[PDB]
Amino acid sequence: GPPSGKTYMGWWGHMGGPKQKGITSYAVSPYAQKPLQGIFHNAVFNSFRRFKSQFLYVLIPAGIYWYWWKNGNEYNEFLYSKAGREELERVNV
């Protein structure tokens, strides 16, 4: 194995990060817990929070886009209708 180029990742025991002191972790065996850890009840009060916190950032842009869609759509059905052939002969040439 020749030299390797330095990066920002290493493997365990030299992962690359800064030198941890102070934190203390605790966990419990996946056997040692309720099957269905926390389902329904209060785990769903979040299925509306994970929603709220973001929806606008999608809806607002989806909105802008879906109304713009509907508009010229309507507008096209018109100028290709009877009631529209007028405007057509003008807009189109």
Binding site: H14, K21, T24, S25, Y26, V28, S29, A32
Partner: protein, 431 residues
């Protein structure tokens, strides 16, 4: 000749040695650092350290006495050691300390000089004694929210919150007669002590029992004290072991014996007939390890303990070892078992047959409390040897194979892997 046991209210036990140059007397309270509670922790190690504060230890220093003390989990002891002839010089100094005197050791100048030294004490331990520190937390997480969890020497937290009103709160409940045993070890007779004991009157809080708590329990869990500034990595791991007076008490100590204890430096250690050792040594996966089957009144901890300067390869360390542990269930060599039985005996000896009376005390005091009597070496050996392979293959088969573990550690343990790995190595894939 077979250890004496007689009670006249005060259960008086003794064990004679005709070749002992000295002897020792003392008491053992059948309630230790696991009869305490979350916020009074270290009360039992606080009691030990006033008992050896210069005051009381200068008294017995003109007299020619030396005092010994230790706290365990299930039990708690107070021993005094002197020449065998000054055997009344012991019993009287004991009597003074535990029924006569009360506030002579419990001074506001004493107690604020002991607690201001059991605080420096438990601040070098959790600071620089990582192998026991790791070992101690192992209990804290395996036996979380339950009796055994409380560290014997107590948290620096519940140890600055405790005044003398608390030393007593534990004393007057758990420092009784119906929870104690007086011991005679070394170079004295049974008819020397139990005579000099019925010589003295009085009775402290008679009829009184000490109290009880929710019986201990075990649960697979971790607790990790990463510290990348500490040159090594310390880890201890285990399963729900076996109690004192459990059918497999010896079966389990034999298993521990197999894999045993390593020290990568002592060339003697490098040659032990341990299978696991074949693996670990190739790349020097560690600096040392050792096993165990810690037994307590209600529950136990079979596992092992290791230190290592080898950080990138800890993941194998834990792996080779926990795989070996699988053999105990599926493929242990009979000829391994014999080397176990053999070595157990040698170890179980230097335990029980050391030429030091103070040890033969706690040993006696604790055992004659829990089962009533002591068990003789010939009794132990007669059991150790009965043990087949099938003994070890059914004990691992319930206790070891695919059961929840209990890891703890500190130092460079980023490399120490996760819980669904480690735990998973309790088994092996089968057709």
């Amino acid at each position: 000749a077979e250890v004496t046991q007689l009670s006249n209210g005060i259960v008086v036990a003794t064990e004679h040695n005709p070749s002992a140059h000295t002897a020792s007397v003392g008491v053992v309270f059948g309630s230790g650092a696991a009869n305490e509670n979350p916020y009074n922790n270290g009360v039992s190690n606080l009691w030990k350290n006033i008992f050896l504060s210069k005051e009381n230890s200068a008294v017995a220093a003109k007299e020619g006495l030396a005092l010994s003390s230790n706290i365990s989990r299930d039990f708690q002891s107070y021993i005094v050691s002197s020449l065998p002839g000054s055997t009344d010089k012991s019993l009287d100094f004991l009597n003074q300390s535990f029924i006569q005197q009360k506030a002579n050791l419990l001074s506001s100048s004493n107690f604020e000089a002991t607690k201001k030294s059991v605080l420096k004490q438990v601040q070098d331990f959790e600071d620089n004694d990582h192998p026991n520190r790791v070992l101690e937390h192992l209990h804290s997480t395996a036996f979380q929210n339950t009796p055994l969890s409380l560290p014997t020497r107590g948290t620096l937290e519940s140890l600055e919150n405790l005044v003398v009103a608390d030393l007593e709160s534990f004393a007057n409940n758990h420092f009784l007669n119906s929870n104690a045993v007086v011991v005679g070890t070394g170079n004295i007779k049974h008819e020397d002590l139990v005579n000099s004991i019925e010589s003295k009157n009085l009775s402290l809080q008679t009829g009184t029992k000490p109290v009880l708590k929710k019986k201990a329990a075990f649960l697979g869990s971790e607790v990790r004290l990463r510290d990348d500034t500490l040159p090594k990595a310390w880890i201890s791991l285990a399963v729900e072991g076996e109690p004192v007076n459990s059918p497999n008490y010896f079966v389990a100590k034999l298993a521990a014996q197999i894999f045993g204890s390593y020290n990568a430096f002592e060339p003697a250690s490098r040659l032990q007939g341990i299978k696991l050792l074949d693996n670990i040594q190739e790349y020097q996966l560690c600096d040392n390890f050792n096993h165990f089957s810690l037994s307590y009144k209600d529950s136990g901890l079979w596992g092992f303990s290791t230190a290592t300067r080898n950080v990138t390869m800890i993941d194998d360390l834990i792996h080779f070892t926990l795989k070996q542990w699988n053999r105990l269930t599926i493929s242990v060599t009979d000829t391994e078992v014999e080397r176990a039985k053999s070595l157990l005996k040698l170890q179980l000896g230097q335990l029980y047959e050391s030429g030091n009376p103070v040890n033969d005390a706690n040993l006696l005091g604790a055992e004659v409390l829990i089962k009533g009597s002591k068990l003789s070496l010939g009794e132990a050996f007669k059991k150790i040897d009965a043990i087949t392979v099938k003994d070890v293959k059914a004990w691992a088969g319930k206790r070891l194979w695919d059961q929840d573990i209990a890891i703890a550690g500190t130092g460079q343990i980023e490399g120490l892997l996760d819980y669904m790995r480690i735990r998973s190595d309790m088994s092996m894939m089968r057709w």
